[PDB]
Symmetry: C3
Subunit: 258 residues, 3 copies
């Protein structure tokens, strides 16, 4: 039917191609550039929105998707996805200001770059994921962190925590030793007595022989037992002496004359 | 005025289009491909640098930006941005070997991929950011780390640290018990005495009754008090007996005759 | 020789250009679009595979690389790299369903986006890396984590671990104090005696003066020494008294008459 270049500055090349708005360019049979400053390249390629660019056969930018850019066979920026950018065959942008990066890629949120993709004939999953490589370590808060950075950051903190736990355990050992020692000092100061050359108990301070207070008590109690017996035995003797003395006095008096 | 294809192998299509260097291609009214192996597609699209490619109306590659690639309406690779790549409408590359990815995107450093973007009519911020989705977990040090990886790596270390702190606290409990027990063993060994059937103090080892050394001392001191009194009382009696005996002897002698 | 548009819906523009399959479009001298729905733009640009798109002079998609998309001077999707996407001058995709993003970029794995690149005249390294900026914090497990997130996540756990170590050290202090105190209570209960107004030993409970059991034992042993001497001395006296009494009795009897 065409080619028909009806817009100002417009160019249309190929059978059926049409460029119908100002500054539109359509190149490829049946391509259509129906937006202002729109560009369509390839067969059946449609750049319908203002400022849209569709590159590759059957690439598509919806007429509502102002500033949409689609590159690759069947790459698409869909309804309401203003400023969408689809990069790769069969990539699809369905969100504003987002990027579907890679063949078969999709978008899921606005203001997003998405590198996951519609899986084909072999996955139970709806979307597959892509590994992202070739990164320098991020420096800014909004830079991507690498696996290397993650490991080093986590490893460093892990070693620092190991180290702190060590210091604290040593502190607790030292503490218990000093606190336990305090009580041991008291025990030692109060529970021993020195023993003399002749067995006399003395202050433990700088003494040759040393014994425990309980042993000293047992031994001293034994001495007391002996003394206790003797005192009772002597008492009996003294009583009998007294009685005999008074009996002698009486007899002396009787001799004298009573 | 044109179209003018003056370079070797050059092609120019559209009113005013020009392709002026070897292997240049300009397609679109007023497009210009002025670099060697340069390609311009769309109205007013300029590929000025050697090996530059500008795709979409008003896309632009500065003549100094050798190897610059710009795709999307108004996408631009600017002065000195050699090997720049602008992907999306109004994307701008101002750094060497960098990529402005997405509509409105910019670059800030050389050797950078940048997915942040010039914000429009509604932000006090100069640049907005984009969330990046669809990643497989990175495996290499220069791979991107995912949120999933970050959480699992940090969570695992966190649990490991919990576990270590537990082991160490239990070690400190066990330690204090054993150290505190040592002193308790000493206290117990030195501060008790066994008590006999008849009250005799003995070694605490395997004794029926047991008392504390201080109680034993108090009780033994009381016995000593009693003995102390008795010894003094007996002494007085013995003194008086002696005096009476000597008096009797004198009287006996007087009876005898002195 | 050409231009030759021999495919259905095909368009070829430029000397030697050829579009030889259904829905193929070749624009640029010596360009070739030899795939179904293939599109080649620029001088010597080859879109050989079905559904391939090659944009920029010398851009190339291998005939086996179905759905390959290459944008930029010399950008290439190579043998067997089906669904490859090369974005930037001299970018090369050698893996299925992968993206070489940026000038000089490469791919290393299938299902990968790669932003590292072949270094040129000044590196001993084969591949350079690119910093990735402009990210919003990831929310999903497959979102990219930012440096900001990594730091905050790691910092928060680090503070939490600090805090836990503090609590546990305080627990160990409190524990040792209470356990050490228990033994101190026992020591104090068993190792002191009260001293009376008149020196009498009593239970330490609510006493004016207090002394240690070992000191009390030493002092009590000294009293016992004194008593021990006295008992022996008194015994000698009592023996002598007895002997004198019996001698007096004998003399009294002799006086009486024996
Ligand atoms: Cl005694
Ligand atoms: Cl006597
Ligand atoms: Cl007498
Ligand atoms: Cl007489």
């Amino acid at each position: 039917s065409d080619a028909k270049a009806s817009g100002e500055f417009s160019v249309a090349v190929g059978n059926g191609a049409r460029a119908t708005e100002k500054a539109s360019t359509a190149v490829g049979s049946w391509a259509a550039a129906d937006g202002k400053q729109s560009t369509a390249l390839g067969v059946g390629t449609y750049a319908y929105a203002n400022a849209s660019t569709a590159l590759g056969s059957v690439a598509f930018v919806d007429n509502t998707a102002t500033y949409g850019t689609a590159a690759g066979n069947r790459a698409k920026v869909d309804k309401d996805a203003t400023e969408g950018t689809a990069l790769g065959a069969k990539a699809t942008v369905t969100n504003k200001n987002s990027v579907a990066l890679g063949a078969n890629s999709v978008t899921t949120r606005d203001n997003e770059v998405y590198i996951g993709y519609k899986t084909g004939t072999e996955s139970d999953k709806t979307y597959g994921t892509r590994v992202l490589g070739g990164l320098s370590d991020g420096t800014r808060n909004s830079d991507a962190a690498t696996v290397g950075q993650l490991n080093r950051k986590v490893g460093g903190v892990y070693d620092d925590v190991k180290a702190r736990i060590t210091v604290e355990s040593e502190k607790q050992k030292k503490y218990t030793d000093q606190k336990t020692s305090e009580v041991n000092e008291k025990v030692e100061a109060r529970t021993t007595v020195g023993v003399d050359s002749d067995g006399k108990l003395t202050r433990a301070e700088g003494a040759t022989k040393t014994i425990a207070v309980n042993d000293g008590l047992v031994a001293l109690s034994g001495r007391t037992d002996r003394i206790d017996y003797a005192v009772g035995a002597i008492d009996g003797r003294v009583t009998r002496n007294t009685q005999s003395i008074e009996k002698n006095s009486k007899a002396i008096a009787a001799n004298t004359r009573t």
